[PDB]
A paper describes a structure:
We previously showed that LJ0536, a cinnamoyl esterase purified from L. johnsonii N6.2, is active towards a variety of substrates including short acyl chain aliphatic esters and phenolic esters. The structure showed a canonical α/β fold characteristic of esterases, and the enzyme is dimeric. Two classical serine esterase motifs (GlyXSerXGly) can be recognized from the amino acid sequence, and the structure revealed that the catalytic triad of the enzyme is formed by Ser106, His225, and Asp197, while the other motif is non-functional. The structure revealed a prominent inserted α/β subdomain of 54 amino acids, from which multiple contacts to the aromatic acyl groups of the substrates are made.
Author numbering:
A (entry chain A): -5 to 245
B (entry chain B): -5 to 244
């Protein structure tokens, strides 16, 4: 604001769980603010998200970025996380943001599963959210769950087990049952304001077809396919992802 | 079980919320179990729900009935409840029931908004749930939120407030935003096993069309329109709804 600028650690509560986040506070009495959502098994302080936050703050756009339940410093077991309760975390964070008296426009920015959170939350709040940036939004998680193959880990999609050993973690059965019937595009499509879609052509984790589909369903969207980029927009690709995001939002 | 019969309080956690419930425990080493779900602003111990649980227990069908988040004895503010986090409560109850070694078949019984929770939970667990009874299930909560009128409380459906005073309570705006796009019939239709639909013809809170619609969508449903019954199946209609429910579950 006019008096304080910089970082602070913030904590919110959703259904008895603490959510830990980082706020970047820019100059000025009034400013826009982005809520930035990390992906599946990630956290709020990946290099991509730290750099999005930094780049937006460089343009006087505030941001908050939280660890979802079951991730980073936030409460709850990973086994108990679903995309639905991450949407609930997102709405709790939105509650905090929309009552801040300095905030003018609210933007959502999401990477991967965090992009599914953002897109569905924007379709639930199409009157309140002003712009959305989706980075490699993992809408394919639904089809993957219907097919019985999530990130190479297989199971009967009609007899989902109670819990699924999942690389080094344990993925909840309820995560997969929710994922199969999540109305991702049905809800997301109700957001008719501007959307920026950014997806690496060499993403082997979420097919770039997810972004080509969101681009079809959205009334006012712009698709940026990034030649050769990977799922995480890492290294030599990170700046372009951060640049497109910031430009879209600074307009 | 073979040694204890009767009522007990049970508590479960869902996220960081405690849910408080009542278990009705019948005779016998193995038995079927109904999970019973109350409606909007109700609690686990309404007359109707108590009578259903007792009637099942007399037929050696166990049951549990919990207060949803933001209701009765359970944790959380009412303002923060939605049908979505009720399905999350119902799933935490299902986790408890499905790991009990005495339980044979699992049934869901839901009244009004508890009926939408039951029908959606059964469409998420169509492999596990064996039968579902819905009493006046409130699927019309969706159309009502799209219309901008929830039990006579009004708002612009395209400009839903942050919160809405509602009788002596505070309803959350997110409840309403959820309601408008809730895929009630899409998810519910995945359950292809037997469903009993019980709806009173003089229900003024939830149109009987709600249960006629479920009857169309379900592969295997039986529809009971009880002539003269109101939303709560009050007075003489209560035993009629209870006996249909018990008979169907067996
Ligand atoms: O957030 C990510 O980085 C990846 C998410 C993702 C991608 C594919 C799936 O099947 C799934 O459950 C989650
Ligand atoms: O549970 C009940 O007894 C009634 C539920 C109900 C009925 C109509 C609505 O619009 C609504 O949000 C909830
Ligand atoms: Cl100021
Ligand atoms: Cl990193
Ligand atoms: Cl988050
Ligand atoms: Cl897929
Ligand atoms: Cl990749
Ligand atoms: Cl749209
Ligand atoms: Cl488009
Ligand atoms: Cl007793
Ligand atoms: Cl026993
Ligand atoms: Cl009562
Ligand atoms: Cl709410
Ligand atoms: Cl709200
Ligand atoms: Cl809210
Ligand atoms: Cl469907
Ligand atoms: Cl009535
Ligand atoms: Cl039918």
């Amino acid at each position: 604001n006019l008096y304080f600028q910089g970082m602070a650690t913030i904590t919110l509560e959703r259904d008895g769980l603490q959510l830990v986040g980082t706020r970047e506070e820019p100059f000025g009495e009034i400013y826009d603010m982005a809520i930035i959502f990390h992906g599946f098994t990630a956290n709020r302080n990946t290099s991509l998200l730290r750099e999005i936050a930094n780049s937006l703050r460089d343009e006087n756009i505030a941001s908050v970025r939280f660890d979802f339940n079951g991730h980073g410093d936030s409460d709850g077991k990973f086994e108990n996380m679903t995309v639905l309760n991450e949407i609930e975390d997102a709405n709790a964070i939105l509650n905090y943001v929309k009552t801040d008296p300095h905030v003018r426009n609210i933007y959502l920015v999401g990477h991967a599963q965090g992009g599914v959170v953002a897109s569905m939350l924007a379709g639930l709040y199409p009157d309140l959210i002003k712009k959305v940036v989706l980075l490699a939004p993992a809408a394919t998680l639904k089809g993957d769950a219907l097919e019985g193959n999530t990130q190479g880990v297989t199971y009967n999609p009609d007899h989902i087990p109670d819990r699924l050993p999942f690389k080094d973690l344990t993925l909840g059965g309820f995560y997969l049952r929710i994922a199969q019937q999540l109305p991702i595009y049905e809800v997301s499509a109700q957001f008719t304001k501007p959307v920026c879609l950014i997806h690496g052509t060499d993403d082997t984790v979420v097919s770039p077809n997810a972004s080509k589909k969101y681009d079809q369903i959205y009334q006012n969207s712009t698709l940026h396919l990034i030649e050769g980029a990977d799922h995480c927009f890492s290294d030599s690709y990170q700046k372009n992802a951060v640049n497109l995001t910031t430009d879209f939002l600074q307009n």
